[PDB]
């Protein structure tokens, strides 16, 4: 009611409401899904256009040859954090001539985003990320939150209407491990489809896919490179 206009203020119940409100900005972006097998990690997004006669907003970003992100929230925070990640990875290749692990990148991201939660005169980062990568420990899927917290995940969906995708993924986790790439991408696409209305469906225009693995750098498939992955989806009735 009146412990809300600042992030340096606790409430009598032990809560900071500006952080809880920044977490509500992830629910305003379009839905993204992330999932991993034992060999590959996949991100599929659903892109959104402002005007019908324009291009769709880009949802997946390249960070290095072994890490990539999909974003839901404010665009500016995502563009700042991506440029942070890229330089933190270049700084690791310069010194050690090795790729930076993903745990050590998301730890840095959390350490970075923790400051606006505690010092006044700066806004909390109102962006959530799903981070797919591959290092010497296998594939990884990481969620990052405006609360400066981060999780290691088997799969996750964030954004508007993402509970449907989460419910889908929660009952197919037992298959993702021994799935090949086609089946894994198809599970991702079906979980994403569960976030749409019954009117709409997936299309070349509004679907982007990001894949990384042992013998595969982080590639992005946007418009016509997606149509191999769509062919195979059962035409669901309602």
């Amino acid at each position: 009611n009146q412990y809300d206009n600042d992030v340096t203020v606790w409430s009598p119940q032990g809560r900071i409401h500006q952080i809880e409100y920044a977490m509500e900005a992830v629910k305003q972006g379009s839905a993204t899904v992330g999932l991993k097998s034992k060999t590959h990690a996949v991100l599929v997004a659903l892109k959104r256009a402002q005007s019908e006669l324009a291009a769709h907003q880009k949802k997946i970003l390249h960070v290095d040859n072994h890490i990539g992100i999909s974003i839901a929230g404010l665009t500016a925070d995502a563009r700042l954090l991506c440029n942070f990640m890229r330089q933190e990875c270049l700084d690791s290749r310069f010194v050690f001539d090795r790729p930076l692990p993903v745990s050590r990148l998301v730890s840095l991201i959390g350490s970075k985003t923790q400051i606006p939660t505690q010092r006044y005169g700066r806004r909390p980062y109102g962006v959530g990320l799903l981070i797919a990568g591959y290092d010497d420990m296998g594939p990884h899927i990481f969620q990052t939150c405006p609360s400066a917290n981060y999780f290691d995940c088997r799969a996750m969906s964030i954004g508007a209407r993402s509970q449907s995708a989460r419910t889908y993924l929660e009952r197919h986790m037992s298959e993702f491990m021994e799935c090949n790439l086609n089946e894994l991408v198809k599970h991702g696409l079906r979980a994403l489809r569960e976030t749409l209305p019954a009117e709409q469906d997936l299309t070349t225009k509004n679907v982007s896919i990001g894949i990384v693995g042992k013998d595969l750098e982080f590639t992005i498939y946007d418009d016509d490179d997606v149509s191999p992955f769509l062919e195979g989806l059962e035409e669901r009735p309602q």
Binding site: V95, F96, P101, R104
Partner: protein
Amino acid sequence: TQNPMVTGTSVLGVKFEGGVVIAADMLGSYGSLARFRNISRIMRVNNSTMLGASGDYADFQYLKQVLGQMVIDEELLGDGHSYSPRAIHSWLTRAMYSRRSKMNPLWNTMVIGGYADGESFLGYVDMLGVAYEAPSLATGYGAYLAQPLLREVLEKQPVLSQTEARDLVERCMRVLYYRDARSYNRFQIATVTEKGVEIEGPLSTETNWDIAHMISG
């Protein structure tokens, strides 16, 4: 460090089938004076890597202090990642080039050995940031005296065993005690295998002085 004060002489290195071996004397000379005679110039870096250095011993202690904390901080995270020997090699090349570029160098020349993922590693870094990789190294007067012996064997038999490599190392140290003046007949040997880093104690070479009876001969 613009001039060295207490110095260490040559360090050797040679690969073999399934590991690397490094050797170095236990002396720190203050000019032409043998002042400290039981100092260890070989370092116990993590179980995949070891390090030996020639030159200013204080700078070697500084690097011993920094790398130790790096490795500790790596261990504290507990996530299945560790610095390979190549990473330590790159980090040292950077650390010495950056000091060279400020004209406050680190007056060292060192030999990095390691074993990770089935392949062996042997590396070199100088005061200036000159680094390379070879199956055989020798710093200081080792480059003139010993390296000819290592290379001649590694062109007739590029793949060695632990035993032959140890014999070759001890022969090279026997020559260095003869023809180098800042040397000492008490040295250490360190080895890497899948078992890890195993350092040996103060070792001595037996020397022959039969040519001294050749005045009229």
